[PDB]
């Protein structure tokens, strides 16, 4: 009732928090999935109305939202500023949070790990096995899983 504890030492700590922002612009062609090139299947498919069209439309709209979720987090500052050409932060010594241009991509020693320790599985980035048509290069070779 007459005393408090006052700090005599402290630590400056850095906490790392990992958050997701978006997913890949995944799309399914309902018709292709169900009927493909089957003319008689389509005839029977039209009987379920626009149910199938709605399915296509909903996935297209999601795809649109995924570009925005990314802008919303990173496009907040649309002007590109470069790293400190001068590192005189007084007592501080860091560049290790900043891009290393000598790397294949302008990634920081920390981003290098945030990328190489993340493997994403996505169709069209994963190519076919046996190939169908076009060069293995780029996105020249068509891929639509099975």
């Amino acid at each position: 009732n007459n005393s408090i504890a006052i700090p005599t030492n402290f630590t400056i700590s850095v906490t790392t928090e990992i958050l997701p922002v978006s997913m890949t612009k995944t799309s399914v062609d309902c018709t292709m999935y169900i009927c493909g090139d089957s003319t008689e299947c389509s005839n029977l498919l039209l009987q379920y109305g626009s149910f199938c069209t709605q399915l296509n439309r909903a996935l297209t709209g999601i795809a649109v939202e995924q570009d925005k979720n990314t802008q919303e987090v990173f496009a907040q500052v649309k002007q590109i500023y470069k790293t400190p050409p001068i590192k005189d932060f007084g007592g501080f010594n860091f560049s290790q949070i900043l891009p290393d241009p000598s790397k294949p991509s302008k990634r920081s020693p920390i981003e290098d790990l945030l990328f190489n320790k993340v493997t994403l599985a996505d169709a069209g980035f994963i190519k076919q096995y046996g190939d169908c048509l076009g060069d293995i290069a780029a996105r020249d070779l068509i891929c639509a899983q099975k």
Binding site: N1, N2, I6, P20, V21, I97, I110, E111
Partner: protein, 97 residues
């Protein structure tokens, strides 16, 4: 402060925070009753080091000299609870009288 980092389809933040590491116990008083006028510090609390009283904020120990200029008057001896009878030094009269 925080610094952002990219990650595939995401963002990782590096949050720079001050977290206390080592505390120490001091005896306090919320106010000093100087001459019937109660003096509160502009910021912080009065602390005893067992001899002298100083002003310091609760987030760090910085014994500041107690003088009228670093306090303000609000209330009297009978208003404030835990108030102590002590001197708040006038910084002006010593150079005039």
């Amino acid at each position: 402060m925080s610094f952002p980092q990219s990650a595939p389809h995401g963002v990782v933040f590096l949050h720079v925070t001050y977290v206390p590491a080592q505390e120490k116990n001091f005896t306090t008083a919320p106010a000093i009753c100087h001459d019937g006028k109660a003096h509160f510090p502009r910021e912080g609390v009065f602390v005893s080091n067992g001899t002298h009283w100083f002003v310091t904020q609760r987030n760090f120990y910085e014994p500041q000299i107690i003088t009228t200029d670093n306090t303000f008057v609000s209330g009297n001896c009978d208003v404030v609870i835990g108030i102590v009878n002590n001197t708040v030094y006038d910084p002006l009269q010593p150079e005039l009288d």
